Design a protein around this nucleic acid. Structure first.
Ligand SMILES: [K+]
Ligand SMILES: [K+]
Ligand SMILES: [K+]
Ligand SMILES: [K+]
Ligand SMILES: [K+]
Ligand SMILES: [K+]
Ligand SMILES: [K+]
Ligand SMILES: [K+]
Ligand SMILES: [K+]
Ligand SMILES: [K+]
Ligand SMILES: [K+]
Ligand SMILES: [K+]
Ligand SMILES: [K+]
Ligand SMILES: [K+]
Ligand SMILES: [K+]
Ligand SMILES: [K+]
Ligand SMILES: [K+]
Ligand SMILES: [Mg+2]
Ligand SMILES: [Mg+2]
Length: 1333
RNA sequence: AGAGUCUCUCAGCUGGUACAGUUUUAGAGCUAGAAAUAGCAAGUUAAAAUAAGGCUAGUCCGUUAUCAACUUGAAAAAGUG
DNA sequence: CAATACCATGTACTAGCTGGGAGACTTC
DNA sequence: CATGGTATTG
């Protein structure tokens, strides 16, 4: 009998809720209170907001999981090696591997001698004197022919296997394969071969030192080009060198090309970009473009190998030894220099670990970069440091061997030294000869990504299947693991099934049948009309077939121009024809047909339908698999059909991506009477030319019937599962589930009566590192030198104007002029589509220009004149990916007619009608839970209307009727937003029931522009642009009242003024990492936690700062003093995340191990983070941990102070209304003192931070002569003192007030504990003072 | 609304791999002093751990999601104002 | 104790699938 | 970043 509606505000950290009646009033009930206190009930307003910490994604958990596997597998590699060495090492040294295992232990805990390698000090000291680094020993074992100690052989091989290098380069690799000098001359060889008239004199050019110099790519290009007179860097030879150096040269101008041949070897799409370039100028230049790829491999290896390969087979280890020797020489020189010239600074540089000198660089925590910054002025100030300063700016001064840049090293280089050492010593140790390939396999073998974890039924992540049930090793992997089935399962466990045929897997996106389907589906809706024709006609089956054979099978893309001339003129003899159903060019194309035509060069083979299954199977293999060996294995059934050259070219062709329909749907099932498949109808369908949508929905065909029969709906998801499968951030998905739980409780509160309406609004939704990468790639592709002229860091790009300055290459976007980086404050940021139409404030709709006036007119998109002169410059930014296609399309829309009136109408509509898919899902979830009954026609009975609104409706409502929000005052605005949503939503559909189609879930341009722009005017009494409306607005047809402008605004004002709002902070057990990850040094402190069971932190260091999973109230006795007399206690024990499983398995045994005796087991209270306690005078506290509290109260500032703070701070309409607001501020200037008074009384009652409050009062009394706006702006900051939750720092003007913390939880042990339901309407209060023996 | 296609873009989820960093130990400090300390020499490398750990013992698993209280119940859940 | 201060693992490469948003062609 | 852990200093 009692009718009501529900308003909801779904956020990432909050769910606001409110209940309203017919009169837009919020009810209030007496709610029973449970527990052991005086209070049996409490009065609650039916409005509030649930607060919760953000839901986290799974990414961090995944990165730690895979890192965990890599540590386990890296250890296994060492275990494999030691198992091979086991028997023979036992003869040489029967405890060598035992000393390595216990190297970490202190001598007290060591069971063997403390020197690992040899077991005595004399041999150990001699080893280090001969091999100061591991790379000295590695080089010796590679070069020497003498028999070596088996322990030194193990150390070298283990070092290579434990740190084996990356796997980014496929195939084999030998140093001196790519000598820069010998690969540069080969480039000059093949260049002068193709250009006999224009040759290059490369004599006297030291190509080795110029290209391998540790300089920037462009500088080395300029250096080499400077050595070639009459040759410019943008010429052909310069573009080849630039391609070898890794730049992005554009070969268009070299070969007078129409297509832009922009090449970069680094991209995976290169070898196709070469063939596009090779198709235009021929294959004679393939020798040239291949000689450059070789030279690039030489220059890359020259970065790693800085040593002449003709003296050693260990160029990497020799290069590390080169680091060591120059480090030794330069350190000797630096010490001698500093001792003579600056003797007083010597102790600071070489002894003080706290400083970034050499001591802090070797012993302290100073990095190479910090060390260079500390010592660069010291070298500049002294004399004789010129060579050291050169090495510093090359980042080659006093280098270590284990460094951050060693990620460049490929595993083939470590393998080369490993293989060489095995070759040297297998002559002396027979077991090395028999295990040479095994040891090499330990280094080279990696688990394929398409195989995954090698589990045996206990991994929810694994999909691998085994050919035989036995332990998988690197040597039996091919025999035990079914790589074929595993790699197939890797994709097929992720790919969609056909929704129409749920048992049929979807075709590959690049399958020939799929592209035939996409072309014929688009082609069948084309229409044409000529002179003699009465009306436009479809294309017949013969015409479509002719268009496919003549155009689609001869051109990769088919434009409309080609359709008019190459078919309608050549075949139909039409001089003029109008085409509909396609613009500019056809979207679909037969790309795979042309890919295979170039590879196999047999057009008749591709056109013969008998080969359809073979070609579909080939593309499937090329799509399913990425490993070229597995691809070759699958294609070997067709080896008899193609030459070996074609089979090799077929292997290289790989496809990714899957379509959305299955082969059985496209060309499998047949219409019963016609006997035709879907594709058959697309090829020919009389004169109806039905397409895919029409065919599967036509009742005169059997396709629709077979689709319904094939549907198989399985087990239903739970609510949580269904929400987890929604497409959205895990953060917003947390709010969605909480929203459903809130509604369930609100319905139970109303006696299981369902509401009339549910109105929902859903808020709209490192980063600087991506911005630098977007500009680096952009400027490099652009070829600009703006980063050379103006360097920048990633953090600076967070400035909106500077980020736009670089994305625009330092130029005005509307004028062909360059901008001044030091004058960005004078320039303007302009919206491409005006913000009055499109509320988009992203970089994608913004532009940096000198003056926004130059955009043209301000009521539309940039003018045609700007487009005519800036289109070429914008397209360069687009190709440089400095602007998106959408940004380019909006910038150029005026040449396509600009913003039409329909576009403006849609823009206003999209400001008010929510169309996000995630909001429709939330509406569908609530709608399906509320409406479950069906009527006589078996159609759903919609008792509950689920309405979705956008935030702009209420925010406009708040500003138009002075119901302002100030988020920093308290959390009430989340609840107030929900209330206003219910009021505005219900009143909107009451006034206009026709709008239910646009706002309720379930199944002229100037007119709609006017209509949707004036839709919210029925709330207003007068409307300028200067009409007037009645005081009472009613529905036109029903006559029912929807809004009373003399009594309903007062109701809304009373609701927003109610001080009692149910703000509930969701209590949550803390999960995640055990503690801080930092491995601290040893110290005498019980805070340290052992990193391993037997690693006493007093000897070994460890962790501290553990996270408390939840606190536990313990009432027990503890032993006291030397006598151990039992003493009754009541205290909070924080159970850490690491301790949680032990505590929950047996709580009494866990507590007794902590010291507690006679634990009152039934009085143990689980207290998660944010547990609520009430003390005296309404003061509340929340549990931050076991030893710290948070603020637990809300400051219910009266509405008059909130509205004043909004208007005074300029948180705005007609000028006279602005002056009225300005007059109201100065008339009520005394509100500033009353606001401070409200803060002071609240703070003295519940905050209890005497020093901070006195500091606040002094700061306010200090700036009383400041402007009212500035005082009001800084009063907003003061509410951080009174905000709910963790104390935080804030500054009033220029005075900073650090947070006052609640560093003790003793007082809550005698306070009242409050258990709240999700809405806080149901409470259980426990007087904890009644506990304690 | 829904569906297929084209172009661009953003996010979610899974797998494979590398480089550092840190921690303890090893890399004989010397000399003058009873010591306190001073003067000087030296430094670049390595082993091992990298969530404690778990049983299911795999070259597997261990940081996401989900969680007021109470009554049942082993739990799964349901119920309670 | 209270006030105060300091601290917090990071980078790089790479193979996929799925979904959301924007504009456009065709449809139910 | 933010805020809970930790030590230091009175
Ligand atoms: K109602
Ligand atoms: K990754
Ligand atoms: K010992
Ligand atoms: K070099
Ligand atoms: K030159
Ligand atoms: K250091
Ligand atoms: K190191
Ligand atoms: K098109
Ligand atoms: K593939
Ligand atoms: K053959
Ligand atoms: K300006
Ligand atoms: K959690
Ligand atoms: K030492
Ligand atoms: K939990
Ligand atoms: K709760
Ligand atoms: K990706
Ligand atoms: K996409
Ligand atoms: Mg481990
Ligand atoms: Mg290390």
């Amino acid at each position: 009998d009692k009718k009501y509606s529900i308003g909801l505000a779904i956020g990432t950290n909050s769910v606001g809720w409110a209940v309203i009646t017919d009169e837009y009033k919020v009810p209030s009930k007496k709610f029973k209170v449970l527990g052991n206190t005086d209070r049996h009930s409490i009065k609650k307003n039916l409005i509030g907001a649930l607060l919760f910490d953000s839901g986290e994604t799974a990414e961090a958990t995944r990165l730690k999981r895979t890192a965990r596997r890599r540590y386990t597998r890296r250890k296994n590699r060492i275990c494999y090696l030691q198992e091979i060495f086991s028997n023979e090492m036992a003869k040489v040294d029967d405890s060598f591997f035992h000393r390595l295992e216990e190297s970490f232990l202190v001598e007290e805990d060591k069971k063997h001698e403390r020197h690992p390698i040899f077991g005595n000090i004399v041999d150990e000291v001699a080893y280090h004197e001969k091999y100061p680094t591991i790379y000295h020993l590695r080089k010796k074992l590679v070069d020497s022919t003498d028999k070596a100690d088996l322990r030194l052989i193990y150390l070298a091989l283990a070092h290579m296997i434990k740190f084996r290098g990356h796997f980014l380069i496929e195939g084999d690799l030998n140093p001196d394969n790519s000598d820069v000098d010998k690969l540069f001359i080969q480039l000059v060889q093949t260049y002068n071969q193709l250009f006999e008239e224009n040759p290059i004199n490369a004599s006297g050019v030291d190509a080795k030192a110029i290209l391998s110099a540790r300089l920037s790519k462009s500088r080395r290009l300029e250096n080499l080009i400077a050595q070639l007179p009459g040759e410019k860097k943008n010429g052909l030879f310069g573009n080849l060198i630039a391609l070898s150096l890794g730049l992005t040269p554009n070969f268009k101008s070299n070969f007078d090309l129409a297509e832009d041949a922009k090449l970069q070897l680094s991209k995976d799409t290169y070898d196709d970009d070469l063939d596009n370039l090779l198709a235009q100028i021929g294959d004679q230049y393939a020798d040239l473009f291949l000689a450059a790829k070789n030279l690039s491999d030489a220059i890359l290896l020259s970065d790693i190998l800085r040593v002449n390969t003709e003296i050693t087979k260990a160029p990497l280890s020799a290069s590390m030894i080169k680091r060591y020797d120059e480090h030794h020489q330069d350190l000797t020189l630096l010490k001698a220099l500093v001792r003579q010239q600056l003797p007083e600074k010597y102790k600071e540089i070489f002894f003080d670990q706290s400083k970034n000198g050499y001591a802090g660089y070797i012993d302290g925590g100073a990095s190479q970069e910090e060390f260079y910054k500390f010592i660069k002025p010291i070298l500049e100030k002294m004399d004789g440091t010129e060579e050291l300063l050169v090495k510093l700016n090359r980042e080659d001064l006093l280098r270590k061997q284990r460094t951050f840049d060693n990620g460049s090293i490929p595993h083939q280089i470590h393998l080369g030294e490993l293989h060489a050492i095995l070759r040297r010593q297998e002559d002396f140790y027979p077991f090395l000869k028999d295990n040479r390939e095994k040891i090499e396999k330990i280094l080279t073998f990696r688990i394929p990504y398409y195989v995954g974890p090698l589990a045996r039924g206990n991994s929810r992540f694994a999909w691998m299947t085994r050919k035989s049930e036995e332990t998988i090793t690197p040597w039996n992997f091919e025999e035990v693991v079914d790589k074929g089935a595993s790699a197939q399962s890797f994709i097929e466990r992720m790919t969609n099934f056909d929704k129409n045929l749920p048992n049929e897997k979807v075709l590959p996106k690049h399958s020939l049948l799929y592209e035939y389907f996409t072309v014929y589906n688009e082609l069948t809706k084309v229409k044409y009309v000529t002179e003699g024709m009465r009306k436009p006609a479809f294309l017949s089956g013969e015409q479509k077939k002719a268009i496919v054979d003549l155009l689609f099978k001869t051109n990769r893309k088919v434009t409309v121009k080609q359709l008019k001339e190459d078919y309608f003129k050549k075949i139909e003899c039409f001089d003029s024809v109008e085409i509909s159903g396609v613009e500019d060019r056809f979207n679909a194309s037969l790309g795979t047909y042309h890919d295979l035509l170039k590879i196999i060069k047999d057009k008749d083979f591709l056109d013969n339908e008998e080969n359809e299954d073979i070609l579909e199977d080939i593309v499937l293999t090329l799509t399913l698999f990425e490993d070229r060996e597995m691809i070759e294995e699958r294609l070997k059934t067709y080896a008899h059909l193609f030459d070996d050259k074609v089979m090799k070219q077929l292997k290289r062709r790989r496809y990714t991506g899957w379509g959305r329909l299955s082969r059985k749907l496209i060309n499998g099932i047949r219409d019963k009477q016609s006997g035709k498949t879907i594709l058959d109808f697309l090829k020919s369908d009389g004169f109806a030319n039905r397409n895919f949508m029409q065919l599967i929905h036509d009742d005169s065909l059997t396709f629709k019937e077979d689709i319904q029969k094939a549907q198989v709906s399985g087990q239903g998801d739970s609510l949580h599962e269904h929400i987890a499968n929604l497409a959205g951030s895990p953060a917003i998905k947390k709010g969605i589930l909480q929203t459903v739980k809130v509604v369930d409780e609100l319905v139970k509160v109303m006696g299981r009566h369902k509401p009339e309406n549910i109105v929902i609004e859903m808020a709209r939704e490192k980063n600087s590192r991506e911005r630098m990468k977007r500009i680096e790639e952009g400027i490099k592709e652009l070829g600009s030198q703006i980063l050379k002229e103006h360097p920048v860091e990633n953090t600076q790009l967070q400035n909106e104007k500077l980020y736009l300055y670089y994305l625009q290459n330092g130029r005005d976007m509307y004028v062909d002029q360059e901008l001044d980086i030091n004058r960005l404050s004078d320039y303007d940021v302009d919206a491409i589509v005006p913000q009055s139409f499109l509320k988009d404030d992203s970089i994608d709709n913004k532009v940096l220009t000198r003056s926004d006036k130059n955009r043209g007119k301000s009521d539309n998109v940039p003018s045609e004149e700007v487009v005519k002169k800036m289109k070429n410059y914008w397209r360069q930014l687009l190709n440089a990916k400095l602007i998106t296609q959408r940004k380019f399309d909006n910038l150029t829309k005026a040449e396509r007619g600009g913003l039409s009136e329909l576009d403006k109408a849609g823009f206003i509509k999209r400001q008010l009608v929510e169309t996000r898919q995630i909001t429709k899902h939330v509406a569908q979830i609530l709608d399906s839970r509320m409406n479950t009954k069906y009527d006589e026609n078996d159609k759903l009975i919609r008792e509950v209307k689920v309405i979705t609104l956008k935030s702009k409706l209420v925010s406009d409502f708040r500003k138009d009727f002075q119901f302002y929000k100030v988020r920093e005052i308290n959390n009430y605005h989340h609840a107030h937003d929900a209330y206003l949503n219910a009021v505005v939503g219900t009143a909107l559909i009451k006034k206009y029931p026709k709008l239910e189609s646009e706002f309720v879930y379930g199944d002229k341009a100037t007119a709609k522009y006017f209509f949707y722009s004036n839709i919210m005017n029925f709330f207003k009494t007068e409307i300028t642009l200067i009409r007037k409306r009645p005081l009472i607005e009613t529905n036109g047809e029903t006559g029912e009242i929807v809004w009373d402008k003399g009594r309903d605004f007062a109701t809304v004002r009373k609701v927003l003024s109610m001080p009692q709002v149910n703000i509930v902070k969701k209590t949550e057990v803390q999960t995640g990492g055990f503690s801080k990850e930092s491995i601290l040094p040893k110290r005498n402190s019980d805070k340290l936690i052992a990193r391993k069971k037997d690693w006493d932190p007093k000897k070994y260091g460890g962790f501290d700062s553990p996270t408390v999973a939840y606190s536990v109230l313990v009432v027990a006795k503890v032993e006291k003093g030397k006598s151990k007399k039992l003493k009754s206690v009541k205290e909070l024990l924080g159970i850490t995340i690491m301790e949680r499983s032990s505590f929950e398995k047996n709580p009494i045994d866990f507590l007794e191990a902590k010291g507690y005796k006679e634990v009152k087991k039934d009085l143990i209270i689980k207290l998660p983070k944010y547990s609520l306690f009430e003390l005296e005078n309404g003061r509340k506290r929340m549990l931050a941990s076991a030893g710290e509290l948070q603020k637990g109260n809300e400051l219910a500032l009266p509405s008059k102070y909130v509205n004043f703070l909004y208007l005074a701070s300029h948180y705005k309409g007609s000028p006279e209304d602005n002056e009225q607001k300005q007059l109201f501020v100065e008339q009520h200037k005394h509100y500033l003192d009353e606001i401070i008074e409200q803060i002071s009384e609240f703070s003295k009652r519940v905050i209890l931070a005497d020093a901070n409050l006195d500091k606040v009062l002094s700061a306010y009394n200090k700036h009383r002569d400041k402007p009212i706006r500035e005082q009001a702006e800084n009063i907003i900051h003061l509410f951080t003192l009174t905000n709910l939750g963790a104390p935080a720092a804030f500054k009033y003007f220029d005075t900073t007030i650090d947070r006052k913390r609640y560093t003790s939880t003793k007082e809550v042990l005698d306070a009242t504990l409050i258990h709240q339901s999700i809405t806080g309407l149901y409470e259980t209060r426990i007087d904890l003072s009644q506990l304690g023996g």
